[PDB]
Ligand SMILES: c1ccc(Cn2ccnc2)cc1
């Protein structure tokens with residue numbers, strides 16, 4: 001009876017040296033991400049809307065143009081909602097579908113529903129158009145390295161639909177895409193043909209990005225079982241800082257500080273966490289001041305902060321995958 005699902009417990013990163021860190025810093029482009037990955041998502045895109053369809057097409061197209069062997073899947077399903085039955089579609093992009101283990105990066109691509117107010121429309125820039133764009137920029141910036149995966153471990157990206165409540169958050173009105181996909185993955189044998197392991201056993205770590213893009217974010221170290229990975233993010237931020245590779249950044253104002261959060265923040269990681277998947281929840285506390293406000297827009301985003309986090313996240317992923 002294989003112990004492969006325990007490999008994640010002993011997995012260590014292959015740390016990048018200074019030269020490699022400089023290479024990663026120079027290899028990502030915040031202006032290219034802004035124009036090509038982010039702006040097309042700064043639209044109304046609540047579930048079932050024309051915008052949801054356009055956002056999904058954009059995400060798929062941006063992944064499809066890459067060289068790495070991404071396998072795209074649209075996970076479409078029905079769920080009861082305050083407005084009756086509706087259809088939702090999660091987007092899953094996977095390198096090496098049959099590899100037993102995957103490091104998983106995720107965010108939600110839907111925007112919260114709000115009727116138009118005084119000619120303004122809610123586009124959820126930090127929530128979570130920026131996280132979406134960061135994942136797309138990561139796939140682009142690391143494309144050559146990821147192409148080499150074509151340690152039975154690879155990478156998967158999940159863009160959840162329906163993270164937001166249609167009304168105000170409640171247990172049955174929220175997390176539509178993640179509740180559905182976690183249940184589906186928990187009941188799907190993995191690798192193909194397995195007798196007693198599921199796709200969830202194959203999820204090494206779920207790194208969920210949410211509410212990123214405002215100035216001065218502070219991310220708490222939420223869970224003991226992923227604390228060592230939170231410490232790696234701290235170390236990466238520190239070294240990139242010391243090498244002069246971050247912009248408008250100080251250690252006093254670092255993003256990954258030494259502090260935990262004992263409370264529970266409901267988000268897409270919940271259905272996975274309650275089924276035993278280790279989670280690194282990259283959501284800041286406190287939330288952006290513009291949270292769930294029409295001001296959660298492009299003008300209020302902090303460019304250098306997002307650029308800095310792109311560098312940190314890309315190093316984290318390469319070190320995790322030994323690339
Ligand atoms: C309360 C309840 C649930 C959440 C989750 N959340 C995250 C992004 N938009 C909403 C936040 C506050």
Ligand SMILES: [Zn+2]
Pocket residue numbers: 112127164292
């Ligand atoms: Zn939200």
